[PDB]
Design a binder for this molecule. Structure first.
Ligand SMILES: CC(=O)c1cnc(N[C@H]2O[C@H](CO)[C@@H](O)[C@H](O)[C@@H]2O)s1
Length: 158
């Protein structure tokens, strides 16, 4: 089991970490969601689906910088909504194919009422997402750590 970003940056068998740079809606009104769809940015696959079934969760999701101070967050993992920053490990998604399959995570970030002005700075770390991979075959328990960075400023109008 291993993962890659949309630009080919890989985290190999055994886990590790990678940077993910995301374009963000430059203007987000109070009452609207800023959507960070990681399903188009992170892809994983099973290296031995002939024998092994891989299990994949979002173990933890943390917010940083302007996302932590200016937004109220929800994470969707495989269609189910949870608080972000996260309070528990998600249920497992099965990876049973060698074909790249999106990691089904998306952040929905709505501005808090105190938000206004440049709410997310360009180049800043906005989130760290820990993917945890196990299987039905051995004791492998690996972390794939995704550091999410904003490619641009995001303003909440005042
Ligand atoms: C041939 C053989 O024994 C193995 C091949 N790959 C192995 N193991 C690798 O691939 C598995 C399936 O994605 C993962 O469950 C493991 O965690 C590891 O990434 S063992």
């Amino acid at each position: 089991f291993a993962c890659k970003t949309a630009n080919g940056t890989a985290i190999p068998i055994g886990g590790g970490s990678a940077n993910v740079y995301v374009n963000l809606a430059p203007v987000v009104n109070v009452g609207q969601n800023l959507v960070v769809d990681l399903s188009t940015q992170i892809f994983c696959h099973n290296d031995y689906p002939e024998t092994i079934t891989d299990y994949v969760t979002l173990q933890r999701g943390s917010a940083y910088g302007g996302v932590l101070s200016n937004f109220s967050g929800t994470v969707k993992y495989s269609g189910s909504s949870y608080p972000f920053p996260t309070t528990s490990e998600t249920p497992r998604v099965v990876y049973n194919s060698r074909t790249d399959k999106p990691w089904p995570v998306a952040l929905y970030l709505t501005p808090v009422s105190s938000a206004g002005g440049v709410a997310i700075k360009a180049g800043s770390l906005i989130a760290v997402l820990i993917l945890r991979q196990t299987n039905n075959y051995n004791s492998d328990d690996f972390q794939f750590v995704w550091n999410i960075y904003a490619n641009n400023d995001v303003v909440v109008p005042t």
